[PDB]
Amino acid sequence: MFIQEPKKLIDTGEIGNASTGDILFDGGNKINSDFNAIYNAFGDQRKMAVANGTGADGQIIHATGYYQKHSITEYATPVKVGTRHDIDTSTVGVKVIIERGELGDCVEFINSNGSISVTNPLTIQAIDSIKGVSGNLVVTSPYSKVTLRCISSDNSTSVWNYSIESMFGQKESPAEGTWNISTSGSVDIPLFHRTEYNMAKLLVTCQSVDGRKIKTAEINILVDTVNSEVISSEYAVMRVGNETEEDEIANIAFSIKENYVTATISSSTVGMRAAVKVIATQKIGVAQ
Amino acid sequence: MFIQEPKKLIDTGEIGNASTGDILFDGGNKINSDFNAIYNAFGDQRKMAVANGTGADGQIIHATGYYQKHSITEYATPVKVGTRHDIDTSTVGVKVIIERGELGDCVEFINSNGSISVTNPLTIQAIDSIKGVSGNLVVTSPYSKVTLRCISSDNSTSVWNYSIESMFGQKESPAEGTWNISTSGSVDIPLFHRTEYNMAKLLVTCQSVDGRKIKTAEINILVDTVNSEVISSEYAVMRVGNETEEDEIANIAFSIKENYVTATISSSTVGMRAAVKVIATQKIGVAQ
Amino acid sequence: MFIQEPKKLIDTGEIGNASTGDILFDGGNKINSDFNAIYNAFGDQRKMAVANGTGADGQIIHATGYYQKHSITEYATPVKVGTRHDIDTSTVGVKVIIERGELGDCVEFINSNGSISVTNPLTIQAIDSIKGVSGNLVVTSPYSKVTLRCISSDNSTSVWNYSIESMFGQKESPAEGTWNISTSGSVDIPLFHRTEYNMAKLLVTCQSVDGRKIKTAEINILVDTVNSEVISSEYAVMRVGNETEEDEIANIAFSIKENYVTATISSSTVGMRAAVKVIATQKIGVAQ
Amino acid sequence: ILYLFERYQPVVKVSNDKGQTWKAVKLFNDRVGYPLSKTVYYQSANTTYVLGYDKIFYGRKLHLGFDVEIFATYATLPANVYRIAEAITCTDDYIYVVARDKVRYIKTSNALIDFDPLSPT
Amino acid sequence: IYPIGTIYENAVNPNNPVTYMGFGSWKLFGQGKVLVGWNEDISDPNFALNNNDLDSGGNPSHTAGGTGGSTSVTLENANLPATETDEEVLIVDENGSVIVGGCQYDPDESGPIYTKYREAKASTNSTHTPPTSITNIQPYITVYRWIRIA
Amino acid sequence: GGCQYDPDESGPIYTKYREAKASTNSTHTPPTSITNIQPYITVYRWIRIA
Amino acid sequence: IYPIGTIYENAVNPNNPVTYMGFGSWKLFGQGKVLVGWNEDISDPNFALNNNDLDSGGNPSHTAGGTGGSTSVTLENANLPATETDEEVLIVDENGSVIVGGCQYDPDESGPIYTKYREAKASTNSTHTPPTSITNIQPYITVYRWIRIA
């Protein structure tokens, strides 16, 4: 970890009315160090052991930013907030000890190769507390993302709530939205391009304009590839303004239309607000 | 909010052939201001009321970046896109009024302490529109993250779709992947280290090499800690190439193997693509 | 795409003891170029065709960073890692060819207007591999986010696992937490402000202090707006330390209390750890 | 150094010392132009502002060995007079140039005003 | 010794192995094709997956039998490194330092002729369309490859 | 070298050059790579290690 | 199992196979050479007709043993696709503009307000004669390869 100073600014009351070289001799010291933090932030600080971030091999800025990789010896010291780190615990489980932070202080960290396991756990000390974490949090997750945020600093109390996320995967929802069931009492909604998912799961809520009749069902669908169909399973049915134990407040029908999985949601009731939300999906790729 | 100028660059046709001090006297003005945006971006702009981001107390760069905290008086003015903000509405609900943006323009904001409530809502005006939001969006969510992105700018029309996320939590999936059911007709998949979750929920789809036989079930599991078991609930069964109403196209079996929850997915059919995807999990921590 | 050099640093052994102008004449060349990467990172590189990022129209820093928009001709060349891009494939499907990366190398990309479709797909070559992707990944998703991360570089092998996310939506969980069932054997938990969701889905796991009795149910709720109620559907019941096929290890009751959806989880068993986790929600907005 | 120059040709005879031996250089882009009154330049603060037949070279001060001026153009100013505009006055923050009655001025800080795609550049 | 899937090689013998072996159902194989270790890895852009065995999703199975490879290659622009002239040239420039275009002659023809230089790039090798190919083939020998089908 | 013509031409054509070697494929950085691999097929090769 | 002409390869053993085998007359074979399926379809330019076995008229026998291929390749002009400068410049030019010196510049000042140019075809890499080669060898391993001569 190359240490950065804060911003360090030049005196313009210097220069043309004062000794040029000297006031500049100072200014470079700033400027040089000044960009260092910049490039050390968005590039490998191990590039300082190189030409000191200079040359074509020198530290470059990543619009994505860079997650600084280092030895454990450096993280053996409380590591400052605001930093992006990438460390892989394949070698061993580590503690990443973090300074007492401030409200809003962030700590971003990752294991890119996902070497983190129980055999390769990751311990963290953010001083005086981490919300939800008694003592030091341990991280066994491969391809996880360590993000700390200090939600209280106060006087002595650095309270870090904690977020962590799998660095990869398919996290999107193909279809989420809301509409009102037409005067025709139905519609057809393209859900996803028929090829995007073998499985999806969605939740539709059909609610009256006055909100009294609101329809809910548990939608589990099997996309049928060869037949260009989608097989549904509905259950756990719930209602409020239901006037009949039969299909009520609306109806849920499915289809594949225009290379889209297309749900057809029909309500005998006019002025029914239906929010179509696909909560989870699945598709099959290659083996392994 | 410390105002930044854009990049402002020095003339090298100056200097050695011209008056040194003057051309430099100008250059510092750039450079000083130039780093200001930088450090004001990645550090507290309230550090300008300090030594102006200078000294050890001065603005520092956060590889994570800094979410700028301010008064409402400043957000009482349309706030420029590209900015990271942290404001806590515990004091009061606020409007954050945003300039008309450009396609791709982002606005990042958070409440770190999560003081946002209905008693502490958050209003936003991004000029001329926010996609999905009629008028000004209000945010009552604690520990939320306000991220605006302008998905249309065009001429007058700044269209902001909107993303928001809980700043914390466990967002990972322990096991997601895909494979082909072996010539043995089954396999054993470590799901998570047996201790990682008390509950998980996953979705397996077993599809033939030619895709005609595709198996789907709704997998709800209870990890059994003391017995080192996992209790399953399967229902809402769906198929396509099913030749029998009994277990068909494949079978789903569970286990805990090698300190891993281990699902054993057995298909009498060879060449069955099975995608194992754990959609949701649960584990118990400490009380409170 | 404006090309950036890496960090390029000034010699202070120059200046006051050497020819001032010359050593400076050089330094500007650095400095100018040096900020260029900076502003080109966090601002439009098409602002270089402008006053070269100078003037008020010049490139500005985005604390959020900027996703660089360009022609395809530029992405017709392997595009370096670390870059944020925004391209809209409405014009046509594109390949974004990426250099062979390093472990930890990131590539961030978006389509802000979501013009990406099957008619507007997006192809990507990250050299020698992308984990899970045979050949070049294609992206048909509107409002997606292309994030590549190189999880292996090694010698020749640039292994890119891949994350992608819908640039928008409601991704938050209103209520997630854990507690121990009281000596009273129950509690009341505010889930969300009663108005936040028409639908929610949560998962509670009630586990004994010694972990032997652990209760699990599948919680599907319909928030009742007019009656200020919440309608539940429970099914797929699973247990471990259950001593009775009836309600066992705990009980799950619901309510709306203090403008909060409030679940009341009652366990006859003392010392029961209950983790309350709301996995999915739904609310209805305006039509369209 | 003394700077000796033809009115139209961007060709500059340089005179280092009280006139004995001189050199010249191109050193100017284009058409140093047609001042009436035989006063080409006004030095405002650090900036020696000279006319050009088409343009305006901005003041900012090679193998001959001693330092000099080289001026690119502040821009090609002239609106609609183009040439002539006999007189050149730059007060700090203001360029001032006039053909006939029209005086047409520029604010020179960092130039307050730039131009964009419409043709010329 | 030679189970199904066995590649046999005899060099000088054109005949079916079952002729000279007296055994097996033998079929010529991999002709003009080298034999490389098929990588068990799924990483190799080449020897990971079999181009020939594709799924419904057109996805190659994890198997040997992938095919491909090229004997020769023709060059195209994108492959050519950044290059430049070996001497300086008069460069069409908007903002440049070399001023020109002022002088009369034209009519009036009495004005002697200064040579009038225009505005574009100079093509290079515009006659190779496409250019001559280069071979991709390394030192080899042709051999009679026999897989035993049965 | 320049005339300037004289003042008052309708032909004041001027282009301002620069003088340098003329780059080619400066956008190819590096150039697009070329494959070295001749025709083939993939097989399971085995060494007898015992 | 090893008819004459059988190609045997032991990985590590340098010795004649008859040493560790006990049988056969073996010859080292295909050194610096890859084995590639010979084709009975004459259309295969390399691996159908046998270059080394020719008839009297030099028609390559259609037989195994065709050889060829190169370890590395040096590039040449015929291989170059259409190319031109990355900028606009002057290519004499004819029609154009360019000028001489009104005031008709004559002696000192000599160099300034004057430029000497020449006209010719601009060289690139003129000092690459030849250029540096690229290898044609794909990932390999050296191996002991014995053909059985008897």
UniProtKB/Swiss-Prot annotation, chains A, B, C:
Which BP terms from GO are recorded? Answer: viral release from host cell; viral tail assembly
What GO cellular-component annotations does this UniProt entry give?
virus tail, baseplate
Description of what induces expression:
Expressed in the late phase of the viral replicative cycle.
The cross-references to Gene3D superfamilies, in alphabetical order and at most eight, read:
4-oxalocrotonate tautomerase-like, Bacteriophage t4 gene product 9 (gp9), gp9
Keywords, A to Z? Coiled coil, Viral baseplate protein, Viral release from host cell, Viral tail assembly, Viral tail protein, Virion
Presence of keyword Calcium:
no
Where it sits in the cell: the answer is: Virion
Instruction: Fill in the domain comment.
Output: The C-terminus is bound to the baseplate, and the N-terminus coiled-coil domain is associated with the long tail fibers.
Provide the function of this protein.
Peripheral baseplate protein that is part of the tail fiber network. Connects the long tail fibers to the baseplate and, after virus attachment to a host cell, probably changes its conformation to trigger the signal for tail contraction. Involved in the tail assembly.
* UniProt-recorded name of the protein: Baseplate protein gp9
Which species? Enterobacteria phage T4
Gene expressing this chain: 9
From Swiss-Prot, chain D:
Q: Domain of life of the organism in this record? A: Viruses
Subcellular localization, per the record?
A: Virion
Self-association and partners: Heterotrimer with gp6; assembles as a (gp6)2-gp7 heterotrimeric molecule. The (gp6)2-gp7 heterotrimeric molecule further interacts with gp25 and gp53. The gp25-(gp6)2-gp7 module is involved in sheath contraction. Interacts with gp8. Binds to gp10 homotrimer; disulfide-linked. Heteromultimer with gp10; a gp10 molecule is disulfide-linked to gp7 and the other two remaining gp10 molecules form a disulfide bond.
Protein family (similarity comment): Belongs to the T4likevirus baseplate wedge protein gp7 family.
What function does the entry list?
A: Intermediate/inner baseplate protein. The gp25-(gp6)2-gp7 module is involved in sheath contraction. Involved in the tail assembly.
Record-given protein name: Baseplate wedge protein gp7
Q: Which organism is it from?
A: Enterobacteria phage T4
Q: State the encoding gene.
A: 7
Curated annotation (Swiss-Prot), chains E, G:
One of this protein's GO BP terms? viral release from host cell
Is Iron among this UniProt entry's keywords?
Answer: no
Extract the coiled-coil ranges from the record: none
Q: Where is this region: Disordered?
A: 49-71
List the record's Gene Ontology CC terms alphabetically.
Answer: virus tail, baseplate
Where in the cell? Answer: Virion
Residue stretches of biased makeup (Polar residues): 49-60
Question: Out of the domains of life, which is the source?
Answer: Viruses
Main subcellular localisation: virion
> What UniProt keywords are attached to this protein's entry?
Disulfide bond, Late protein, Viral baseplate protein, Viral release from host cell, Viral tail assembly, Viral tail protein, Virion
| Signal peptide residues on this chain, from the entry's feature table | none
Q: What induces it?
A: Expressed in the late phase of the viral replicative cycle.
Q: What does this protein do?
A: Peripheral baseplate protein that is part of the tail fiber network. Connects the short tail fibers to the baseplate. During infection, the baseplate undergoes a conformational change from a dome-shaped to a star-shaped structure. At this point, gp10 rotates and acts as a lever that unfolds the short tail fibers, which then interact with host cell surface receptors. Involved in the tail assembly.
Q: How does it assemble?
A: Homotrimer; disulfide-linked. Heteromultimer with gp7; a gp10 molecule is disulfide-linked to gp7 and the other two remaining gp10 molecules form a disulfide bond. The gp10 trimer interacts with gp11 trimer and with the short tail fiber (STF) composed of the gp12 trimer. Part of the baseplate macromolecular complex which consists of gp5, gp5.4, gp27 (central spike complex); gp6, gp25, gp53 (inner baseplate); gp7, gp8 (intermediate baseplate); gp9, gp10, gp11, gp12 (peripheral); gp48 and gp54 (proximal region of the tail tube).
Protein family (similarity comment): Belongs to the T4likevirus baseplate wedge protein gp10 family.
Q: What is this protein's record name?
A: Baseplate wedge protein gp10
Write the gene name: 10
Q: Which portion of the complete protein is shown here?
A: 453 to 602 of 602
